[PDB]
């Protein structure tokens, strides 16, 4: 139960939960897999950030 | 129950949860792979992110 | 139950769930594979992103 | 010039050039990217062997 | 020049050469990325082999 | 130049050379990535072998 500003999640037997609210939750899997990657400024393999 | 503002999120016996509410939440699966990707200001393999 | 500003989700028994109110969540699968990819600026395999 | 049993190559100026000549050369790009891939036995990502 | 048994590989300012004449070169990228891969005697990611 | 079984080779101002005659030589990138990989005998990652 909640009063005041926020977020409820509810589960039973289940394989996956998360509840992110405002930060970058990373589960899965990833393979990047680069070369000759030139670029002033670039994100190469940025894979799930926040800014 | 919910008093304020905020989300909710019921389930039972599921094979998959999530509730991001501002971030970025990553899960699934991803194979980049790239060559010879120049580019000033590049995002080469951004793969879920918020900006 | 809501009694101010918000979305609810409701299940029973299912396989995928996920309420995103602003983020970016990822859950599938993804297989980008590129090759000699120039552009300034560019955004090769952006996969699910804000911005 | 040969003289006796043999493959010859010749090229100028090119950008690509192999003579494999029964093993297995890679140069390309590839990014298998899979999920819940049972079965016995199996060769879930070859990607250019030889048996 | 050759006398006996054998491969000749001649070039001019190339940009790739590779003359395996029975084992296994691997000069590519590759990104694999797998999950839940069940399965006796299973080769998940060969990415260029000899057998 | 040969007088006897053998593999000859030239080239000039190129970005790629290699000759492998029954070993396993490797030079590009790789970004194997598993979870939850069973099976007796398997070879998950094998990225450029010989057997």
Do not use: L, P, R, Y
Request: no cysteine; aromatic share 2%.
């Amino acid at each position: 139960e909640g009063v005041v500003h926020g977020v409820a999640t509810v589960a039973e037997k289940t394989k996956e939960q998360v509840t992110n609210v405002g930060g970058a939750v990373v589960t899965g899997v990833t393979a990047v897999a680069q070369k000759t990657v030139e670029g002033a400024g670039s994100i190469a393999a940025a894979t799930g950030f926040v800014k």
